[PDB]
XYZ file of N, CA and C in Angstrom:
246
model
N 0.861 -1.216 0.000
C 0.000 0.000 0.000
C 0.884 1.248 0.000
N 0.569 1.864 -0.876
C 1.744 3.458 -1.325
C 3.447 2.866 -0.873
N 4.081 3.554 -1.255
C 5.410 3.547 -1.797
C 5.796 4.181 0.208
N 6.969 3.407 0.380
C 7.770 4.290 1.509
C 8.736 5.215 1.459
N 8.492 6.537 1.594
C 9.395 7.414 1.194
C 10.617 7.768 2.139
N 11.657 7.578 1.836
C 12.668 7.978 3.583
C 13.129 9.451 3.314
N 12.466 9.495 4.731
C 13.057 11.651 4.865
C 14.343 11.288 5.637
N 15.717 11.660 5.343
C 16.558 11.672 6.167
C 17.034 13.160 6.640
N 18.000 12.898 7.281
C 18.568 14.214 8.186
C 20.381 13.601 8.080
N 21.065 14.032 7.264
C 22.044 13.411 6.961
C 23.061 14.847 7.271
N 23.955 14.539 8.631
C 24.662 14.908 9.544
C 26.232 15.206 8.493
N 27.133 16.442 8.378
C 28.130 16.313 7.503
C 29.199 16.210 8.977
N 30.053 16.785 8.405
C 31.790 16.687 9.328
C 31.842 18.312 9.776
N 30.590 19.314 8.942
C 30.918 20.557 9.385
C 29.653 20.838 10.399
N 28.408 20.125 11.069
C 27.322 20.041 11.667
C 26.877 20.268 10.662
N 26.391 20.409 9.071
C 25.706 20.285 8.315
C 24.544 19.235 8.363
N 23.368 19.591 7.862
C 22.075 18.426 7.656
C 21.862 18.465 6.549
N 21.944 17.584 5.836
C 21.014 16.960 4.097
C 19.968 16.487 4.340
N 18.852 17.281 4.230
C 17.802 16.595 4.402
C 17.286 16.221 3.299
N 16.763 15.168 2.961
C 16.631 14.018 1.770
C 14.980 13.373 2.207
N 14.440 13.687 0.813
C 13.004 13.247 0.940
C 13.136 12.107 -0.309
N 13.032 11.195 0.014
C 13.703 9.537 -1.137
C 11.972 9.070 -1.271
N 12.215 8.604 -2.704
C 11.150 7.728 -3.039
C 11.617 6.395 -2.890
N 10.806 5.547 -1.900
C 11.286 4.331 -1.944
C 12.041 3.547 -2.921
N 11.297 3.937 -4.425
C 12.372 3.407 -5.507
C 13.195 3.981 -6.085
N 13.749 5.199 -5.467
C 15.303 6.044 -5.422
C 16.236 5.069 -5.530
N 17.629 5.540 -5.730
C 18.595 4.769 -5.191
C 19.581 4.916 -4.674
N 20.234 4.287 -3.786
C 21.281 5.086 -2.502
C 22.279 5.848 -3.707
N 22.952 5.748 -4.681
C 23.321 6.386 -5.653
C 22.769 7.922 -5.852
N 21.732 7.622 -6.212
C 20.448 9.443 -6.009
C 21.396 9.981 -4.542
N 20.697 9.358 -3.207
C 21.280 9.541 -1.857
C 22.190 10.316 -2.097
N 23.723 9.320 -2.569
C 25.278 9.884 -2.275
C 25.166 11.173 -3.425
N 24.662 11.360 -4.489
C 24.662 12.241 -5.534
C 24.298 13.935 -4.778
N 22.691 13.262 -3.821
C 22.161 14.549 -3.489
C 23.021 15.224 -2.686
N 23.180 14.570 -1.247
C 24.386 15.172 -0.454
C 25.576 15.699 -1.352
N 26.483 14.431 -1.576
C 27.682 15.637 -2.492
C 27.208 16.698 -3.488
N 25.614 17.021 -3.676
C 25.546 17.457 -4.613
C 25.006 18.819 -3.642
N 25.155 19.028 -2.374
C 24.710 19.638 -1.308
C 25.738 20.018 -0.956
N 26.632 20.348 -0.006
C 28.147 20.881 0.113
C 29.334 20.246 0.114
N 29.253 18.612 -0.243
C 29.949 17.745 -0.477
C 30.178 17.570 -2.039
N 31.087 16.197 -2.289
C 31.963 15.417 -1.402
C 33.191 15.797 -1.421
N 34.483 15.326 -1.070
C 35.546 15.641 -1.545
C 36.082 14.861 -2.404
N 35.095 13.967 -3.262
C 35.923 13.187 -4.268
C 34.829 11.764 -4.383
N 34.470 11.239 -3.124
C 33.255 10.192 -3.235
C 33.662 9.716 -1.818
N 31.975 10.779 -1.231
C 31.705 10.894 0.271
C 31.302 9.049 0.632
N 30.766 8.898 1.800
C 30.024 7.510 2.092
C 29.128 8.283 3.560
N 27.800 7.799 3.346
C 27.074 8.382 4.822
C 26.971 7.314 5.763
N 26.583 7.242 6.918
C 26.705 6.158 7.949
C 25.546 6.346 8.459
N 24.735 5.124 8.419
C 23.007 5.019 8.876
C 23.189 5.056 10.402
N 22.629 5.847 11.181
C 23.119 5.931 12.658
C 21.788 4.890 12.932
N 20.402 5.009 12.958
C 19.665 4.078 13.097
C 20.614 2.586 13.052
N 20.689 2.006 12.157
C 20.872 0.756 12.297
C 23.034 0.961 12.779
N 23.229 1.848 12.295
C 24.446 2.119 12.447
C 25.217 1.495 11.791
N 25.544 1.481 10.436
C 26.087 0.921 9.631
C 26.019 1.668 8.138
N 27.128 1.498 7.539
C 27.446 1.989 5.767
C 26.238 2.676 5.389
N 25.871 3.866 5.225
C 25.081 4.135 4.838
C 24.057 2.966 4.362
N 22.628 2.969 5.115
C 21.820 1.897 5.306
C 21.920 0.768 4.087
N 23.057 -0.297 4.389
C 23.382 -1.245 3.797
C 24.072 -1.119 2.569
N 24.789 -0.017 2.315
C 25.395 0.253 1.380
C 25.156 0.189 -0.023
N 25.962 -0.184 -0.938
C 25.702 0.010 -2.769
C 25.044 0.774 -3.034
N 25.860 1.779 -3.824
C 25.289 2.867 -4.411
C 24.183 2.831 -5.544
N 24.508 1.455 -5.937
C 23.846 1.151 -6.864
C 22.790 0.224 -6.744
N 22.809 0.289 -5.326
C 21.163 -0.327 -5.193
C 19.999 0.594 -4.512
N 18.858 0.167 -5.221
C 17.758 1.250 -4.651
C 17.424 1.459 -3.266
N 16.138 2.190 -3.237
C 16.273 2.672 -1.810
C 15.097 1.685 -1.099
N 14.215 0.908 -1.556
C 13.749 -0.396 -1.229
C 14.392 -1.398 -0.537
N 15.395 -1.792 -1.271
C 16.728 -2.482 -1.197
C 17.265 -2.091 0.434
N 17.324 -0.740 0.090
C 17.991 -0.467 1.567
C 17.260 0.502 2.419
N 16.003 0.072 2.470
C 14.962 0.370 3.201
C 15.014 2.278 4.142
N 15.128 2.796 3.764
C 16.334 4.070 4.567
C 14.574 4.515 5.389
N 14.123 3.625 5.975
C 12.735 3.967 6.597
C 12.026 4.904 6.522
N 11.025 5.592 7.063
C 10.573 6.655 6.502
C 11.174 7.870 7.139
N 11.711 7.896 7.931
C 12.654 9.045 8.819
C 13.864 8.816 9.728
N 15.296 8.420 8.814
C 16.368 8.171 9.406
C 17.360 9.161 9.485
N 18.473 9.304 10.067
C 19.624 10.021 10.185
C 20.712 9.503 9.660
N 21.436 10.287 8.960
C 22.474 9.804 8.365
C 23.714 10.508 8.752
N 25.411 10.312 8.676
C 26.444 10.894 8.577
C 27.102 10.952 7.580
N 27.466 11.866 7.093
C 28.631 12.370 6.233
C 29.783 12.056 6.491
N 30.852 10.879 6.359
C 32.160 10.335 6.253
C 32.735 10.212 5.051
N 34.406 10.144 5.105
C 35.425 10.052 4.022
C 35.379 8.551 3.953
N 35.592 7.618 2.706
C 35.949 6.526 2.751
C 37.513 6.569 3.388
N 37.711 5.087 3.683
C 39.054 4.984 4.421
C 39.355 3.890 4.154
């Protein structure tokens, strides 16, 4: 029944927030695009799902946002890969 949309609040390294309104069939790709496309990245950011607390909610950029369920209102962080 209707599509789950995730509103995030995605936290940078400067107290910055990306707030991100995702159509469930977005894809974490869209995600990493919008933020760096917001005051990031320095080259190819990665966010960190504080909810479940892990790789930006289950990682691959190239998988949708179904896939990685980013619920309907999560928090995210702004990190450098390492």
């Amino acid at each position: 029944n209707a599509e789950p949309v995730s509103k995030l609040r995605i936290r940078t390294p400067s107290g910055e927030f990306l707030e991100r309104r995702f159509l469930a069939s977005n894809k974490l790709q869209i995600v990493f695009d919008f933020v760096a496309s917001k005051g990031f990245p320095w080259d190819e950011y990665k966010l960190l799902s504080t909810f479940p607390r892990r790789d930006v909610t289950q990682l691959d950029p190239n998988k949708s946002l179904l896939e990685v369920k980013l619920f309907p209102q999560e928090t995210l962080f702004l990190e450098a890969k390492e």
